[PDB]
Paper text:
Here, we solved a high-resolution crystal structure of the extracellular cysteine-rich domain (CRD) of yeast Wsc1, which shows the characteristic PAN/Apple domain fold with two of the four Wsc1 disulfide bridges being conserved in other PAN domain cores. Given the general function of PAN domains in mediating protein–protein and protein–carbohydrate interactions, this finding underpins the importance of Wsc domains in conferring sensing and localization functions. For this purpose, we determined the high-resolution crystal structure of the CRD of ScWsc1, revealing a tightly packed globular core domain stabilized by four disulfide bonds. Our Wsc1 CRD structure reveals an unusually high number of surface-exposed aromatic residues that are conserved in other fungal CRDs, and can be arranged into three solvent-exposed clusters. The protein surface of the CRD contains three aromatic clusters that are conserved in the CRDs of both ScWsc2 and ScWsc3. Mutational analysis demonstrates that two of the aromatic clusters are required for conferring S. cerevisiae Wsc1-dependent resistance to the glucan synthase inhibitor caspofungin, and the chitin-binding agents Congo red and Calcofluor white. Our mutational analysis reveals that these surface-exposed aromatic clusters play essential roles in conferring sensor function under cell wall stress conditions, indicating that they might be involved in eliciting appropriate cellular responses via the downstream CWI pathway.
In the yeast Saccharomyces cerevisiae and other ascomycetes, the maintenance of cell wall integrity is governed by a family of plasma-membrane spanning sensors that include the Wsc-type proteins. These cell wall proteins apparently sense stress-induced mechanical forces at the cell surface and target the cell wall integrity (CWI) signaling pathway, but the structural base for their sensor function is yet unknown. Further studies have demonstrated that ScWsc1 function requires the presence of the N-terminal CRD, which can also be inactivated by mutation of its eight cysteine residues that are a hallmark of this highly conserved domain. Purification of ScWsc1 from yeast cells in lipid nanoparticles and transmission electron microscopy have recently provided the first broad three-dimensional model, which confirms the proposed tripartite organization of the sensor. These studies suggest that ScWsc proteins may act as mechanosensors that detect structural alterations of the cell wall by their extracellular CRD and STR domains, and, upon stress, undergo extensive conformational changes, which are transferred to the cytoplasmic tail, and trigger activation of downstream signaling components of the CWI pathway.
Residue numbers in the entry: 14 to 110
The structure:
Amino acid sequence: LVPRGSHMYEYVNCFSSLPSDFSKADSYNWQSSSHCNSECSAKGASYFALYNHSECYCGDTNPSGSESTSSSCNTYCFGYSSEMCGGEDAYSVYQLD
Ligand SMILES: [Cl-]
Ligand SMILES: [Cl-]
């Protein structure tokens, strides 16, 4: 739509783990940040997290307050390979608008 600001979500950080309020929304062969945003927006969630190429989690608390950051969000999103869907042991966390 526009080249910058078209996505109704903002990257927070890469985290080692998720707070207990995060729950798996889906596993998907075409997982991506925009797919997970739509999944979690439909649930009314405030945050979403990508994990290990294919998994999408939704949650309501900011992991910044409770989990350590990570530099190992290195598993590409199956549905958008230039973006990382967390890592094997790390979560790419975004905030929904
Ligand atoms: Cl830019
Ligand atoms: Cl897009």
